[PDB]
Amino acid sequence: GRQSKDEQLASDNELPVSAFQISEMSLSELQQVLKNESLSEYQRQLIRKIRRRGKNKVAARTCRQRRTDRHDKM
DNA sequence: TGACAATGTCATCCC
DNA sequence: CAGGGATGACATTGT
Ligand SMILES: CCCCCCCCCCCC[N+](C)(C)[O-]
């Protein structure tokens, strides 16, 4: 199969959570993660970029569906 | 491997 | 605040 780059990222950077986790975990969850873990700044930054992408791709989705839904047919 | 579809990324605006 | 939803353009990936 295959992995996301963000998964590779998280992995390369030894993040205590997964890309998937990162992006889907709830905010309060994430916050625990962040108050409890030793995370360089780079790792912190990373986690934020990952979540961004992570939420945006989902978002990209819909859009398109709506895009594609709304015109293509209806 | 090359076409064509599909997904992801990023910049921006928004709330 | 901040985080995060929309969407348009461009990029990478999948089949
Ligand atoms: C959707 C659920 C995602 C939230 C998962 C949180 C689990 C992270 C725990 C990592 C543990 C690492 N450590 C430092 C405690 O050993």
Query: If we measure between CA atoms, which residue out of A32, A36, A33 comes closest to residue A10?
Result: A33
DSSP helix, strand, coil percent of chain A (3-state; round to 5): 75, 0, 25
Rounded (5°) CA angle A67-A68-A71:
85
Q: How far apart are CA A10 and CA A21, in angstroms?
A: 10
Question: If DSSP codes are grouped into helix, strand and coil, which group holds residue A40?
Answer: coil
Query: If we measure between CA atoms, which residue out of A62, A56, A61 comes closest to residue A24?
Result: A56
Question: If DSSP codes are grouped into helix, strand and coil, which group holds residue A38?
Answer: coil
Cβ burial of A72 (10 Å; 0-12, 13-18, 19+) is exposed
Is A34 near strand C, with its CB below 7 A from some atom of it? no
Domains in chain A: ranges and CATH: 1-74 (1.10.880.10)
Q: For this experimental structure, what is the resolution in angstroms?
A: 2.5
Chain B bases closer than 7 angstroms to a protein Cβ = 7-11
Which atom of ligand 1 is nearest the CA belonging to A25?
A: 1
Tell me the H-state helices in A1-74. 5-12, 19-24, 27-36, 41-70
Write down the residue that tokens 């199969």 correspond to.
Answer: A1
